Amino acid sequence: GVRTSPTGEKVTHTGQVYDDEDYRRVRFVGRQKEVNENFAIDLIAEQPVSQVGSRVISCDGGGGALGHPRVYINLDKETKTGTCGYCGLQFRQQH
Amino acid sequence: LLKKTTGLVGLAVCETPHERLKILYTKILDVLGHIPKNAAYRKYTEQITNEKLSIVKAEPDVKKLEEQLQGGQIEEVILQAENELSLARKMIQWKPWEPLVEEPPASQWKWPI
């Protein structure tokens, strides 16, 4: 979900864009500002919330030893989902 | 048997090794007599030089003398005798049996700091 300043410059997933009166836009004159158009904050929002029947879930990001350190997430709050701290996949107790 | 070469470059074959070792050992002891008797250098060097001189006097063969002097070739045993003689002639002038000239400071050899 890349957006654009009034200067025409693309805003990154950080939120970085130069000011209009900043001289350092001259480095992109005749060249391009390389941004990545796959924003991870939007791509993890696209993932569905996993309904599990347990009270404590374990996440390793998939792949076993190719993901992250395995963590255990508590699902006793019903207002909030249980979000993994590494991969951002969020879980919910189904009851 | 007239060993053809010593194997070490610059170290030539000694034709008469026994008499050379005897002369160097007696000259070491004659120089070493000028050191005071309480010095440990004189006691230790007299001890090892008397051992080497008795081993030289106890063996006519060159190669058996090489195996029981335990110093390799006989010519590097001769070279070590020359080095010990030069050392003892320097130890007379240095006089290192004297007490320690200066104590180090209080944390001079304290590691880690």
Binding site: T12, T14, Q16, E34, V35, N36, N38, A40, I41, D42, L43, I44, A45, E46, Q47, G61, G62, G63, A65, L66, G67, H68, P69, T83, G85, Y86, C87, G88, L89 | -
Partner: protein, 176 residues
């Protein structure tokens, strides 16, 4: 337990003396050298046809850096700065903050590719396989600052080479 190189006393019978003199006058070892050079003239050379043929690499190869993603689009870097604590060149500069959903993510992930010694301590220190040192080695630039990668360039290298990087990690990760 040792051997004497060059301690051969030569023979002085007329056979060996005439052999050495024929070697001197008729240049036997020089024709032996010409024969060895002529032997390599008729061998197939070892030259590969670069750029069309490529030198063989292993999946452990340490080339261009890339920040990876999980198989959902979420980036693997959780801003923990182990790759810049371990970095022997101090080539990695990291600044972080919680982003808009509360995830521990970087805002600055710089690698100076002209400080980097390409030793791969960052990919082996990374707890979540975020920074890797991929298989690209043909990335020479015309300007010095094009080798000063920010997070956008490294995430683009990840998106560019993930189909290869994931397979190399798949081939190697049981040695790690």
């Amino acid at each position: 337990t040792y051997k004497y190189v060059n301690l051969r006393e030569p023979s002085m019978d007329m056979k060996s003396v005439t052999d050495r003199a024929a070697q001197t006058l008729l240049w036997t070892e020089l024709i032996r050298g010409l024969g060895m050079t002529l032997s390599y003239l008729f061998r197939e050379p070892a030259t590969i046809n670069y750029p069309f043929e490529k030198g063989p690499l292993s999946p452990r190869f340490r080339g261009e850096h890339a920040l990876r993603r999980y198989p959902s689009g979420e980036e693997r870097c959780i801003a923990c700065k182990l790759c810049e604590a371990v970095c022997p060149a101090q080539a990695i500069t990291i600044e972080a903050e919680p982003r808009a959903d509360g995830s521990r993510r970087t805002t600055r992930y710089d690698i100076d590719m002209t400080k980097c010694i390409y030793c791969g301590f960052c990919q082996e220190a990374c707890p979540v396989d975020a920074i890797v040192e991929g298989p690209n080695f043909e990335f020479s630039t015309e300007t010095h600052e094009e080798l000063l990668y920010n997070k956008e360039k490294l995430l683009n290298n990840g998106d560019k080479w993930e189909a290869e990087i994931a397979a190399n990690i798949q081939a190697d990760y049981l040695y790690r």
